[PDB]
Amino acid sequence: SLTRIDHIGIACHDLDATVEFYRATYGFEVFHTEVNEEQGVREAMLKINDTSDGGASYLQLLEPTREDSAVGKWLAKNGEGVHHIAFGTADVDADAADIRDKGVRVLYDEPRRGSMGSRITFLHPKDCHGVLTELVTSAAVESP
Amino acid sequence: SLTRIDHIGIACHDLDATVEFYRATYGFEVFHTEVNEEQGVREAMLKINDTSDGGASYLQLLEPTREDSAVGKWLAKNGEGVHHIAFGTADVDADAADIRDKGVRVLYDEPRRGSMGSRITFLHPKDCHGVLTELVTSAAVESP
Numbered sequence: 633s634l635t636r637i638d639h640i641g642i643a644c645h646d647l648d649a650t651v652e653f654y655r656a657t658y659g660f661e662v663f664h665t666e667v668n669e670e671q672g673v674r675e676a677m678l679k680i681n682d683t684s685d686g687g688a689s690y691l692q693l694l695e696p697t698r699e700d701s702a703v704g705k706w707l708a709k710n711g712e713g714v715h716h717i718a719f720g721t722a723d724v725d726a727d728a729a730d731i732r733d734k735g736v737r738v739l740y741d742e743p744r745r746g747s748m749g750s751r752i753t754f755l756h757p758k759d760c761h762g763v764l765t766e767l768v769t770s771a772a773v774e775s776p
Numbered sequence: 777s778l779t780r781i782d783h784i785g786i787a788c789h790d791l792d793a794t795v796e797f798y799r800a801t802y803g804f805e806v807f808h809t810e811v812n813e814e815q816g817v818r819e820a821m822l823k824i825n826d827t828s829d830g831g832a833s834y835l836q837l838l839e840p841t842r843e844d845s846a847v848g849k850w851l852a853k854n855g856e857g858v859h860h861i862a863f864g865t866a867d868v869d870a871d872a873a874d875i876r877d878k879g880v881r882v883l884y885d886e887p888r889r890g891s892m893g894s895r896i897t898f899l900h901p902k903d904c905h906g907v908l909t910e911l912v913t914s915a916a917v918e919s920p
């Protein structure tokens with residue numbers, strides 16, 4: 633089952649400028665940064681709070697590494713803003729299979745690598761009332 | 777200070793259909809429903825988790841009551857999807873004054889009523905890298 637909001641994915645043109653905006657305005661600090669070449673993003677995770685399922689909630693800021701990428705295409709069409717939402721689960725494989733069985737498009741056969749070694753999948757936004765929806769299992773098994 | 781993600785505001789054409797989508801797909805149940813005539817929305821809050829600051833994180837689904845409203849205009853332009861993000865604080869007045877002093881546009885002089893008697897304000901999306909950003913203090917003082 634989906635037991636938390638894991639993160640809000642926010643697309644931006646300049647990761648370093650947008651990271652600084654969040655730090656200066658709200659005091660949010662960088663929890664982690666990494667590049668995901670498969671996904672075509674440079675990302676920064678900003679931890680906002682811990683959650684009742686033993687996990688955490690983050691802002692995931694995303695700069696495209698290339699124009700021909702999910703985020704590069706989205707930014708070109710829509711400008712900076714919220715790109716996706718992500719829910720956490722202890723068993724992304726099982727929850728993705730259950731959602732596939734409801735006729736919602738699951739974009740990956742098998743979960744792929746996300747931030748901090750997590751295992752991720754996505755649901756198609758046109759099946760989710762316009763919201764690109766990620767399902768995430770953290771690499772570190774967390775304690776409710 | 778901003779101590780949690782309070783909610784994700786998600787605009788939809790049909791609140792009851794979108795509520796049912798979230799229930800059927802993810803098992804999320806309705807925590808509360810209300811109409812905010814000033815804001816021009818019918819809303820449903822779906823609680824996803826509790827947070828380390830004593831608060832909670834919700835999906836806030838929003839149907840416009842009228843076309844001439846923030847959400848009615850947004851839906852007409854963009855279709856269904858994520859409308860805003862909201863951060864929680866124990867002192868919305870103080871945090872809004874600090875952010876005003878950074879040159880980010882605060883849309884209200886004084887916080888206004890939000891869901892479940894909360895006190896709310898908004899930051900202009902063009903000052904927040906494209907994200908309409910809400911600040912929320914819950915009506916019930918919560919215990920970290």
Ligand SMILES: C[C@@H](C(=O)O)C(=O)SCCNC(=O)CCNC(=O)[C@H](O)C(C)(C)COP(=O)(O)OP(=O)(O)OC[C@H]1O[C@@H](n2cnc3c(N)ncnc32)[C@H](O)[C@@H]1OP(=O)(O)O
Nearest residue numbers: 641668671702703706715739746747752754757762763764
């Ligand atoms: C690394 C990981 C982590 O946790 O670290 C991440 O988050 S990586 C984050 C970046 N990676 C991802 O997003 C991977 C998952 N996304 C994708 O595979 C793609 O972006 C799709 C969702 C398949 C969309 O690709 P597609 O080729 O269809 O592009 P498109 O422009 O033709 O989009 C088709 C329709 O989907 C809509 N659409 C596209 N992206 C959307 C988004 N982010 N939110 C909502 N709607 C979206 C378009 O407006 C269009 O609607 P109309 O019919 O109205 O024109």
Ligand SMILES: C[C@@H](C(=O)O)C(=O)SCCNC(=O)CCNC(=O)[C@H](O)C(C)(C)COP(=O)(O)OP(=O)(O)OC[C@H]1O[C@@H](n2cnc3c(N)ncnc32)[C@H](O)[C@@H]1OP(=O)(O)O
Nearest residue numbers: 785812815846847850859883890891896898901906907908
């Ligand atoms: C009840 C409470 C609760 O907690 O219960 C809620 O959440 S109530 C939720 C509903 N209420 C609210 O949202 C109230 C706060 N929002 C507002 O006052 C408004 O929507 C504004 C943010 C002032 C935008 O109004 P405005 O008159 O400027 O409309 P507009 O279409 O001309 O927008 C001007 C520029 O802002 C952009 N823009 C507009 N709405 C946006 C949004 N939700 N996210 C990101 N960007 C947004 C437009 O694309 C445009 O960019 P371009 O320059 O690129 O064209």
Ligand SMILES: [N+]
Nearest residue numbers: 641692718766
């Ligand atoms: N993500």
Ligand SMILES: [N+]
Nearest residue numbers: 785836862910
């Ligand atoms: N909201």
